[PDB]
Amino acid sequence: VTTTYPGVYLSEDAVSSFSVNSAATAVPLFAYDSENTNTINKPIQVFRNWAEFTVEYPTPLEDAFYTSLSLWFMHGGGKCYLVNEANIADAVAQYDDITLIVAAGTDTTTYTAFTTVVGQGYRIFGLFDGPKEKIAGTAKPDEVMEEYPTSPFGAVFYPWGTLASGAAVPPSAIAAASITQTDRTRGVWKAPANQAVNGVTPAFAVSDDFQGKYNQGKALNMIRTFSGQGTVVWGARTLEDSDNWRYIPVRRLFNAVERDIQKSLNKLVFEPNSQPTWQRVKAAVDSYLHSLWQQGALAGNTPADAWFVQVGKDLTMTQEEINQGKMIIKIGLAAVRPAEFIILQFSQDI
Amino acid sequence: NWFKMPGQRQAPNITLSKGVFPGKNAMYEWINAIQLNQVEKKDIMISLTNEAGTEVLVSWNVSNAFPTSLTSPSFDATSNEIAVQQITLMADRVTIQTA
Amino acid sequence: AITADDIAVQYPIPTYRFIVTLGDEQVPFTSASGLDINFDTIEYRDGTGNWFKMPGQRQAPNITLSKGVFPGKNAMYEWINAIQLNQVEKKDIMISLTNEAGTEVLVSWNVSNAFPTSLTSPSFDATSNEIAVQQITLMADRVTIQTA
Amino acid sequence: AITADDIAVQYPIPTYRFIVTLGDEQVPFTSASGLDINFDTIEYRDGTGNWFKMPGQRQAPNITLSKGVFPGKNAMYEWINAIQLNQVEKKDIMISLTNEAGTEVLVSWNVSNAFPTSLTSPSFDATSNEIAVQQITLMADRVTIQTA
Amino acid sequence: AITADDIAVQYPIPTYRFIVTLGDEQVPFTSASGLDINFDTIEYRDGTGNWFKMPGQRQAPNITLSKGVFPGKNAMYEWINAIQLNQVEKKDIMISLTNEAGTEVLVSWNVSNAFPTSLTSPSFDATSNEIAVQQITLMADRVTIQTA
Amino acid sequence: EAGTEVLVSWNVSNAFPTSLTSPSFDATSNEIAVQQITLMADRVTIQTA
Amino acid sequence: EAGTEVLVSWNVSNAFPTSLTSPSFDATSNEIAVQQITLMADRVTIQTA
Amino acid sequence: EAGTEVLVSWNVSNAFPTSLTSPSFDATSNEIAVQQITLMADRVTIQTA
Amino acid sequence: DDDDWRYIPVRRLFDAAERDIKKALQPMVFEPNSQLTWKRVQTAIDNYLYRLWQQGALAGNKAEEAYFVRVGKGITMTQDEINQGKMIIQVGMAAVRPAEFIILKFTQDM
Amino acid sequence: VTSVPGVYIEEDASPAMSVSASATAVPLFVARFTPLKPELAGVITRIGSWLDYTILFDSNVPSSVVDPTASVALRLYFQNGGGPCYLYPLEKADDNGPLAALPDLIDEVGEITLLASPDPDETYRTAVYGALAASLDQHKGYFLLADSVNGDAPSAVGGSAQVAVYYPNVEVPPLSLPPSALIAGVYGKTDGERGVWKAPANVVLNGVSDVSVRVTNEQQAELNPKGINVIRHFSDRGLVVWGSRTQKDDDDWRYIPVRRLFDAAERDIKKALQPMVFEPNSQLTWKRVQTAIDNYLYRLWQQGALAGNKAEEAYFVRVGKGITMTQDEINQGKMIIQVGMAAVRPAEFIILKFTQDM
């Protein structure tokens, strides 16, 4: 409307609104395809809420970047980035805030730029996609999972969405919206699985015997619907099936610890490389890890079994390394693993 | 049978005191910036130190300290003393690291 | 480090800072209590063992406010004096826990159709250093909690 | 020598460390009382002298919980506002005395089908340094004590 | 864990929610009593010892409705004033146990041909605090119960 | 208490309903709608087991 | 004080429990969780020895 | 009190039952099932010893 | 001929609710455009829409299915819109449609 | 065609049919259903009432000496106690394509409990009973309602405890129907009125008039020590289902109501513990899971399902680290719970033993 007189106005235009209920540990990058026709030619653009997103895209589209963001902002969601697939390796290295790389219906170009920023060490977690066609069941599961990396920083999340306006949500965005509601209420150390994402339904119905072939190895991480907890993601594993870096909780837990410690220790850079500074470093970490332990994130009912921090002149580094300007800490800390299998054993004996 | 147990540890009340200098009062802008429950809580480290200052012997760590009082000095015309402010802090735990 | 913008998110709220919107005006009060939500209880037992427990119908709240006596015009006497056998200007009560500046609501308790039922005089005592405090009690139909 | 693993076996348990599982979620509370197991009494006397004393039928527990007011969303208002004349989401209450880490139960008091009957507002006072505390009272049918 | 959709199937219905469709209009009432189904009893005994017990013919229901006195027109008065020696607009009454919002009828009672036989004005008293409540009695011929 | 034992029972031979009183509806009450049926019978016997 | 011989005793004949109260849970209290059971009986006897 | 002395007794000559009322069963009650029998007699005498 | 505004009682319900909300918010004009005023305006609309729902006007069963009122700074506004002196409120309702066709479908088989 | 806002009158309507609500008897009728719109030809559709059947499927289907009986079998289902009633239209028998894809489509829908394929052809059901036999021993909680041909089990499902056979074909005014569409109805009627722990074997069959074979006692005496469960005719009552045994000859799983009590309790415990998946595998979670099972098993005992007198004789729930698990099993991310119950068995033999000596 156009405001002229100081009264009260009445309009009946079609509007929408979503409130931001964000979490700091989930700032995603939504990758879109370079061969797209209905985007602004800016390669990197920043959207803080739903109101700023509908200024640049005033009409409801059907393309995979629009349904990913419309499903993002309706579950809280904070600031987020639209970067085209040929620039996602640059945007992670420039904007310093990104924790998630959400492949919004994108493959084989996000994948080769995912493995670039992981080998450079940018503490991100990727959310990939399953096939848009239906997996048959005679599929030979190693042949389905051959386009994906083997890094512990990613998960696949197969079944595509069929959002209530008819459009198709990429299943990375279904996983990215359950991460937001998990990190706010339960924390980054809790699994994003049993959180109910709303407004979207899976395109296909998946049984238990189908997921049992894919739960090992490279971990498709199904999106299933249940009477009760409706349309949750079902599975919490990564692309590496090791005893260390299985379980998306314990990977995203250390990425939150590694980023928040280096945010606190950047204010101690260019201090004199001396023994009073090393005491001030290891007490800035013990103060962080104690408050993190007492809110349930670490696994141990004593501080000795939960974390250790140590630094010394002949403990972690030598005099040849002091003279180079290096300060070597080493920190070890234990995470909580989720309960993935519940076995009931019934009998007719008392 | 008598059963004796440790309870829950209560909060430390920490007293720091320094002199009044001609510059700006850094302990004043940290107690003036209170909005009804809001305060920039800081972590305090008090380290027993070498003479030159290049070695920390035993230090005391304080987790989340915020000011609760700031007493101005008592002005007296028949005194020979420094204007000494005395700030009290409310914290939640005190730990000791020894290196 | 607690970084006081996080205190405004996850620390609780004290009870000494509140704005009372009384109809369409703000009136400064000292105390405010009784904004409860109470239900009754329905029970049913049969001979087989089934106990059936149910919420009844919610009853009316009784809100009591108290403020001091000021030398000007008494706005709470002018609202309890305008009773003619049924006829009272009902008002909307809003009691909002506010920030220290007084400009934004943390959490509010709303009260729908309140009208005064009592107004107590202060206790006059020649050996007391106190402030003259009137205490008005209100009766309404609904208590609503909006959080923002 | 008392060797504190023996304190975890044969010393009693204090009341300041407890987790309240409220349905399927954990909600932090300050106080919790009223989880009693009460019976009635049947009596019968004849003229010869036989007194017959018997337990009656057990009546309903009334559990009261209290927590502080936080700036976010009020979960206890959203559960007492969803009353439609009979219809309330009953929940399972679990109040477990826990270790200091918070990860294992010492002894628990379970409550079967609880629904809210009251919710009190905090007492607003301009001369008080206190925290806004809501107090909800619940009504259920059974109190169970599991020990592990 | 009762999940209140099961309360709408399995728990009994309280009395305090009811709508009264009086003819072709709904009229708000406070009370509604006397919607019984009563029979007579016919008995027969002989000398051999046979007792024969039978239901007789069902007699008329006497239905009591009561509502308050409002400043408009008295709709229960113009229906009892329009009597000409046997002539009365007989109406059919429906009293429905209702949902809280009013959008579901749970169990309703149907009344076939009701006409007023009395209308008691309220007792005026200067030392009372009550509503002027009229109380009308109706004569009908049958009462049926439909359950949906 | 569980329902798995009958202590003393009362048998009624040929019962048929003679009345069924609907509940009294009242807007200022907190009660269950309770129907009350009366029956006409011919004998009442008591078996004790 | 050793616990091995009775000075005076209060005997109670046929007691059964009628109540059992939970402890009062408070996050700001240094107390021990105390249950309180109440019993009902028929006779109280005092033996002295 | 012990039952070993009769103080005042009431004698009833030829009693026979005319009624036997079963208890009223109620799910919201805490009472004993009490039967109540009425008797028809012909005289009542009092012996005092 | 739209599905929304087909009937007279659905149309005149929205015209009467917009007229009575407008008469209620005109005391809140030339108030300070702050977050305290936005909650005073939200409650004045929420009190009006609640007493339409409880007298049968709105088609709901929970009162969160009948209506909603939304106001905020991240929601429904931008900071450039407060600075030019306006507040923007999103109000929605749900009305019930009348039964205008009754089909009887008789038979004599049972 | 309604345009005038008055009241319209039609004169040759059919009477509508009521449907009940149940959660323990939701069947999957595999028969020759003919769709109207052909997109629902090889999938499973939910039919909430008889009105939903007449819109989605062709309910008339005029005959040609062959007679369509799939629409008649559903009308006898809703007359005997309805339900959500999933359907799978499967046209001819020998297409081994859709029958191989059948047990994978059943698992995609969450809530099938009964199978009960209602088709009068004999070789049609044998292809269905053989395709569903591998899914009955996979702890998924299904229960097959097979039909005997001449007095024996159809041999695709020999002695599994998940199968209840029902012998006599039931005739409708006269086309003869297999009784599985009617018995799937009377399970939902019995469970709604009495519970799953009650034997579904005194229900009078609504609708139908007479069975095809009037079965004597002496041939039921060689059939009831198998699970054959004869539909009998009693002159005062009508057609009464008479027998509540399964195919398993074990003392544990002999009866239908003992078997379907355990299938329904395992199904409702499973729906209650799925919010407790991907929780931290700690001792706090193990007590939250133990209480959620203990609250469920207590409210079965106090409504008469379990055979106990103390509630420590009815059930038990056990979980721990020294008990039911080892530390190597927590580390691989699983919790192991031992649940036991005690059910009551029905009285199926009454011996009278008259005399005249006293």
Side-chain angles (χ1 to χ4, degrees), chain A residues 194 339-341 343 345 348, chain J residues 277-279 333 335 337 345:
Chain A
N194 282 316
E340 194 178 4
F341 306 106
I343 294 97
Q345 291 178 354
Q348 200 175 358
Chain J
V277 182
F278 299 105
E279 292 291 327
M335 63 181 74
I337 308 156
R345 281 90 171 95

Side-chain angles (χ1 to χ4, degrees), chain C residues 40-44 54 56-57, chain F residues 27-32 34:
Chain C
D40 290 330
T41 294
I42 316 295
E43 293 179 356
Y44 182 77
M54 286 164 282
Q57 55 183 353
Chain F
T28 64
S29 68
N30 285 316
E31 287 180 354
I32 286 300
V34 172

